[PDB]
Amino acid sequence: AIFHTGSELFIITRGPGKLTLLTWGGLNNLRSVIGAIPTENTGVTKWAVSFSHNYTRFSFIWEGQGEACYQIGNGLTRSPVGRSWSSSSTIHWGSSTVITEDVTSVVPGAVNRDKVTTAYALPDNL
Amino acid sequence: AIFHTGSELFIITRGPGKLTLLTWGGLNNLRSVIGAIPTENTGVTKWAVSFSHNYTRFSFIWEGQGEACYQIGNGLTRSPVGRSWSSSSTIHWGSSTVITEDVTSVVPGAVNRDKVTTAYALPDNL
Amino acid sequence: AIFHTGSELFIITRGPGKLTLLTWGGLNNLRSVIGAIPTENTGVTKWAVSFSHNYTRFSFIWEGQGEACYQIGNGLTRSPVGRSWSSSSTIHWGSSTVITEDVTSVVPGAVNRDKVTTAYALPDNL
Amino acid sequence: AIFHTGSELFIITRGPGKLTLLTWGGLNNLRSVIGAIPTENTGVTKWAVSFSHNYTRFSFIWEGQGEACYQIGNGLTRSPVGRSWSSSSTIHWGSSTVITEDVTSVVPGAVNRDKVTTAYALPDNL
Amino acid sequence: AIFHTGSELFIITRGPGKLTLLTWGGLNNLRSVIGAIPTENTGVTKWAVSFSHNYTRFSFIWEGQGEACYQIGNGLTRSPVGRSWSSSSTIHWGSSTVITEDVTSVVPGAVNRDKVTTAYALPDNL
Amino acid sequence: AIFHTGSELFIITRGPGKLTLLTWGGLNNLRSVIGAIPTENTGVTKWAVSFSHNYTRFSFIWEGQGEACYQIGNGLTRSPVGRSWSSSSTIHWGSSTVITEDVTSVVPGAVNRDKVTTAYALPDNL
Ligand SMILES: CC(=O)N[C@H]1[C@H](O[C@@H]2[C@@H](O)[C@@H](O)O[C@H](CO)[C@@H]2O)O[C@H](CO)[C@@H](O[C@@H]2O[C@@H](C)[C@@H](O)[C@@H](O)[C@@H]2O)[C@@H]1O[C@@H]1O[C@H](CO)[C@H](O)[C@H](O)[C@H]1O
Ligand SMILES: CC(=O)N[C@H]1[C@H](O[C@@H]2[C@@H](O)[C@@H](O)O[C@H](CO)[C@@H]2O)O[C@H](CO)[C@@H](O[C@@H]2O[C@@H](C)[C@@H](O)[C@@H](O)[C@@H]2O)[C@@H]1O[C@@H]1O[C@H](CO)[C@H](O)[C@H](O)[C@H]1O
Ligand SMILES: CC(=O)N[C@@H]1[C@@H](O[C@@H]2O[C@H](CO)[C@H](O)[C@H](O)[C@H]2O)[C@H](O[C@@H]2O[C@@H](C)[C@@H](O)[C@@H](O)[C@@H]2O)[C@@H](CO)O[C@H]1O
Ligand SMILES: CC(=O)N[C@@H]1[C@@H](O[C@@H]2O[C@H](CO)[C@H](O)[C@H](O)[C@H]2O)[C@H](O[C@@H]2O[C@@H](C)[C@@H](O)[C@@H](O)[C@@H]2O)[C@@H](CO)O[C@H]1O
Ligand SMILES: CC(=O)N[C@@H]1[C@@H](O[C@@H]2O[C@H](CO)[C@H](O)[C@H](O)[C@H]2O)[C@H](O[C@@H]2O[C@@H](C)[C@@H](O)[C@@H](O)[C@@H]2O)[C@@H](CO)O[C@H]1O
Ligand SMILES: CC(=O)N[C@@H]1[C@@H](O[C@@H]2O[C@H](CO)[C@H](O)[C@H](O)[C@H]2O)[C@H](O[C@@H]2O[C@@H](C)[C@@H](O)[C@@H](O)[C@@H]2O)[C@@H](CO)O[C@H]1O
Structure with missing residues (x-):
């Protein structure tokens, strides 16, 4: 299952832009979160994307x-990330696969946590 | 503030062991989580540690x-991680500092999520 | 087009094995070539795969x-390499894409050039 | 012998310029090839240089x-590359050594394959 | 003991500036040395800092x-380097610890060996 | 001149062995030093070799x-290190060149400083 030890979610991007994570399907009416994480790197950025406990849906796009591309664990395969919420990269909690899912209906309700959500660019010195 | 873009929480370890994260101070009666993340690496392991939305306390040890050591963002400083819950590495949500805090009183109430909490070893091919 | 500057053919493998390249579709009645390139590396091996002038078909497998996986140029995508001649990774000279092709009919007549064909493991010190 | 597994031909350059490969000494009247591969990198560029099957001479210069410098396999030594065709770096197919050879007489007959010959700059993300 | 095999003195800096080493406590009234080593790197610079035989005090600052930060051997800890002579990073020959020590009274008597003392920025191609 | 900023002395070795540095030509009858610096790395070790103030001769071998090989500054060339004191790599203080020199006559009078002289293997985490 993605997010388990051995199946960690990594992203690789080129050039500047924002990776946005939508955290949703919260148990007992937990508020959904949307937050854009910017990079200004002109080259390659590597990223770790986390889940939040008590949520069952995680969707992300690169703008x-x-x-x-995403990579799961130390797997060699790198596959394109969604570029809009209508074709988001999405993980169902417990799934071993990233699927394409339209989550446009989820976004408007989410609270904004730009630069404070669970996706992280790795720096030059790690 | 740690966990914000630019102040991401990274760990560096040498040799095998477990990095254990206690996610606590939940809003809305959310259950605290404790989960050990194992590495079998004999060398250097680099890690990304995430918070979970709706929690206000994050404490970790290396077993x-x-x-x-931890590193904040692209900062050069690397400082020892706590090695027992009575001297845990602890972040109060919104703080820019990792403090040493006794969270022995929090641990027994937490639910176990070993190999499924928000701390991730980076692989050899990222 | 693959093999042009900017669209170089790279491979990434994990663990020991052999990458085999089949050079065929020769102009001027050139004979077909097959050669296995072994690695004993336990971890990640990166490779450069070259064409030969005057040939129009390049097929490769990992055993x-x-x-x-292969990567084209500096592109981020990494996609699985074929694992038998009946579903080889194949490039038609001029194509920008790697296809799956059965080339089992070419193999028996190809001249054997094991450890002396146009695929190279990159060393630890480049 | 250079181009065999363990004796792969690598180049290391600093700053922008062009690596040109001259593939010649073709069997069965195969036409000679000359092709320049440019880099605009301001720093170090690493290169893999391949032979073509059916040719017995490979000569290269840096402009x-x-x-x-060239490096053979995972060997440590790095030695200067020729800078003009009258003192080209040259490999006689079968040789373990890079020699200096004047191939000015070979150049005019070669077909031009600029950006499509068997020398490759390695990308930032391999 | 710092400067023994396994406890080598390394520095990590960000951006341009000068690392200055003060070599003092010379046996048999050997002359004290001060020399600034500049970097113009915009990003991270890694450094090896050596002692000189027959000296018992080594102090350094970053401007x-x-x-x-300094790192001892392959140890994970990185700790801030002194930024003035009144709170220099200092090593007593035979000590395993870098201390803060005011050496302002040592500087004026030391002979100037700018760009020729025993502290070295590592290049991009090592 | 070697050892000046821009012309730092670096070594690259493969496999386990010892790099031995002989510090001699001491001003005012300063005692000569010989010290072996071991590596147990199975692959590449990178090294920084320092002079000591007040000495005019530096000789080293690899066993x-x-x-x-040695590399000067960010130069691309890498050239073999001597393998015995009769064919030592030697630097005359102020020279821009490493020469081969027999220093067997200097060795017997040098004091032993094994694992405590001015040559440093770089660690896995720098
Ligand atoms: C049409 C064709 O096959 N072109 C190839 C060319 O054949 C000609 C033939 O058409 C007629 O003109 O007689 C000529 C005698 O002077 C010659 O035989 O011959 C080239 C030499 O064999 C050949 O190029 C070689 O093979 C290619 C696959 C490639 O490796 C080249 O780098 C190599 O020199 C011609 O093939 C075409 O070359 C162009 C080069 O721009 C393209 O690559 C095409 O995709 C190739 O078909
Ligand atoms: C001696 C020679 O020319 N051998 C090359 C061989 O020629 C024979 C020809 O002599 C006669 O026997 O007809 C045969 C057809 O029935 C064949 O044409 O042809 C080989 C190709 O089929 C050729 O090998 C090619 O060219 C080489 C330069 C190299 O690129 C090979 O990978 C490639 O397949 C023979 O050349 C020798 O190949 C051996 C292979 O081990 C050595 O590399 C020698 O150095 C080559 O001269
Ligand atoms: C059936 C159900 O809804 N269970 C709730 C937990 O969610 C499940 O947790 C298990 C734990 O092994 C497993 O992940 C299932 O997939 C979840 O449906 C819930 O666990 C909390 O929320 C999860 C989404 C996960 O983040 C977990 O680590 C977290 O503790 C608990 C909360 O106490 O309540 C259960 O009712
Ligand atoms: C006063 C209060 O409790 N606010 C609640 C939110 O917590 C604060 O959120 C802001 C968000 O900008 C900031 O992080 C403060 O430090 C929090 O105290 C709470 O937000 C949710 O929980 C937070 C701990 C944080 O994880 C945030 O991303 C998450 O959305 C909201 C939403 O449930 O409830 C508010 O009452
Ligand atoms: C003063 C003394 O007792 N010994 C002198 C040496 O200094 C010591 O060297 C030993 C070597 O095992 C050890 O490092 C002690 O900490 C030193 O105090 C001195 O050695 C020279 O200078 C040293 C500072 C050190 O750099 C060493 O490598 C160098 O050879 C010798 C020669 O001057 O004199 C002894 O009397
Ligand atoms: C003999 C002379 O002209 N000067 C002596 C110093 O040696 C020279 O130092 C200069 C500095 O630019 C230069 O390196 C010359 O090539 C040296 O001959 C000598 O300096 C001490 O020993 C040196 C070998 C060198 O290590 C230097 O950094 C060190 O301080 C001093 C002794 O303090 O005496 C001068 O007369």
Whole structure:
């Protein structure tokens, strides 16, 4: 299952842009969250994307001009990230697969946590 | 503030062991979570540690025999991680500092989520 | 087009095994070539795969327990390499895409150039 | 022998310029090839240089302000590359050594395959 | 003991500036040395700092806008370097610890060896 | 001149062995030093070699089955290190060049400083 030890969610992007994570399907009416994480790197950025406990849906898009791929764990495969909420990269909690899912209906209700959600660019010195 | 873009929480460890994260101070009666994340690496492991939305306290220890340090964002400083819950590394949500805090009183109430909490070892091919 | 500057053919493998390249579709009645390139590396091996002038077909497989993907140029996508000649990774000279092609009919007549064909494991010190 | 597994031909350059490969000594009247591969990198560029099957001579030069050295396999030594066709770096197919050879007489007959010959700059994300 | 095999003195800096080493406590009235080593790197610079035989005191500071930390051997801890002689980073020959020590009274008597003392920025191609 | 900023002395070795530094030519009858610095790395070790103030001669050898080369500053060239004191790599203080020199006559009078002289293996985490 993605997010389990051994199946960690990583992203690789080129050029500047924002990776946005939508945290939703919260148990007992927990508020859904949307937050954009910017990079200004002109080259490659590597990222770790986390879940939040008590949520069952995680969707993300890349809005930069350059490529963006995900990798699961130490797997070799890198596959394109969604570029709009109508074709988001989405993970159902417990799933081993990233699917394409339209989550346009979820976004308007989410609270904004730009630069404070659970996706992180790795720096030059790690 | 730690966990914000630019102040991401990274760990560096040497040798095998477990990085254990206690997610607590939940809003809305949310159950606290404790989960150990194992590495079998004999060398250096780099890690990304995430918070979970709707929690206000994040405490972690390294249970392995080798060294463990944290780094904030692209900062150069690397400082020892706590090695027992009475001297845990702890972040109060909104703080820019990792403090040493006794959270022994929090641990027994937390639900166990070993290999499924918000701390991730980076692989050899990222 | 693959093999042009900017669209170089790279491979990434995990663990020991052999990458085999089949050079065929020769102009001027050139004979077909097959050559296995082994690695004993336990971890990630990166590779450059070249064409030969005057040939129009390039087919390759990975034979190993571990994963194998190709990457084109500096692009972020990494996609699985074929694991038998009946579903080889194949490039038609001029194409920008790697296809799956059965080339089992080419193999028996190809001249064997094991450890002397146009696929190279990159070393630890480049 | 250079181009065999363990004796792969690598180039290291500094700054922008062009690496040109001359593939010649073709069997069965195969036409000679000359092709320039440019880099605009301001720093170090690493390169893999391939032979083509059915050719017995491979000669290369670097045209740039900055240094250029070759390395054989995972060997440590790095030695200067020729900077003009009258003192080209040259490999006789079967040789374990890079020699200096004047191939000015070979150049005019070669077909031009600029940006489509068997020398490759390695990307930032391999 | 710092400067023994396994306890080598390394520095990590960000941005341009000068690392200055003061070599003092010379046996048999050997002359004290002070020398500034500049970097113009915009990003991270890694450094090796050596002692000189027959000296018993080594003190250093970083003058630059960016961060500077030292690391002992392959240890994970990185700790801030002194930014003035009144709170220099200092090593007593035979000590395993870097201390803060005011050496302002040592500086004026030391002979100037700017760009020729025993502290070295590592290059991009090592 | 080697050891000046921009012309730092770096070594690259493969496999386990010892790099031995002989510090001699001491002003005012300063005692000569010989010290072996071991590596147990199975692959590449990178090294920084320092002079000591008040000495005018620096000679080094590599004892191991694998290769050893030196590199000056950010230069691309890497050239073999001497493998015995009769064919030592030697630097005359102020020279821009490493020469081969027999220093067997200097060795017997040098004091032993094994694992405590001015040559440093770089760690896995720098
Ligand atoms: C039409 C064709 O096959 N072109 C190839 C060319 O054949 C000609 C033939 O058409 C007629 O003109 O007689 C000529 C005698 O002077 C010659 O035989 O011959 C080239 C030499 O074999 C060949 O190029 C070689 O093979 C290619 C696959 C490639 O490796 C080249 O780098 C190599 O020199 C011609 O193939 C075409 O070359 C162009 C080069 O721009 C393209 O790559 C095409 O995709 C190739 O078909
Ligand atoms: C001696 C020679 O020319 N051998 C090359 C071989 O020629 C024979 C020809 O002599 C006669 O026997 O007809 C045969 C057809 O029935 C064949 O044409 O042809 C090989 C190709 O089929 C050729 O190998 C090619 O060219 C090489 C330069 C190299 O690129 C090979 O990978 C490639 O397949 C023979 O050349 C020798 O190949 C051996 C292979 O081990 C060595 O590399 C020698 O150095 C080559 O001269
Ligand atoms: C059936 C159900 O809704 N269970 C709730 C927990 O969610 C499940 O947790 C299990 C734990 O092993 C498993 O992940 C299932 O997939 C979840 O449906 C819930 O656990 C909390 O929320 C989860 C989404 C996950 O984040 C977990 O780590 C977290 O503790 C608990 C909360 O106390 O309540 C259960 O009713
Ligand atoms: C006063 C209060 O309790 N506000 C609640 C939110 O917590 C604060 O959120 C802001 C968000 O900008 C900020 O992080 C403060 O530090 C929080 O105290 C709460 O937000 C949710 O829980 C937070 C701990 C944080 O994880 C946030 O991302 C998450 O959305 C909201 C939503 O449930 O409830 C508010 O009452
Ligand atoms: C003063 C003394 O007792 N010994 C002198 C040496 O200094 C010591 O060297 C030993 C070597 O095992 C050890 O490092 C002690 O900490 C030193 O105090 C001195 O050695 C020279 O200078 C040292 C500072 C050190 O750099 C060493 O490598 C160098 O050879 C010698 C020669 O001057 O004199 C002894 O009397
Ligand atoms: C003999 C002379 O001209 N000067 C002596 C110093 O040696 C020279 O130092 C200069 C500095 O630019 C230069 O390196 C010359 O090539 C040296 O010959 C000598 O300096 C001490 O020993 C040196 C070998 C060097 O290590 C230097 O950094 C160190 O301080 C001093 C002794 O303090 O005496 C001068 O007369």
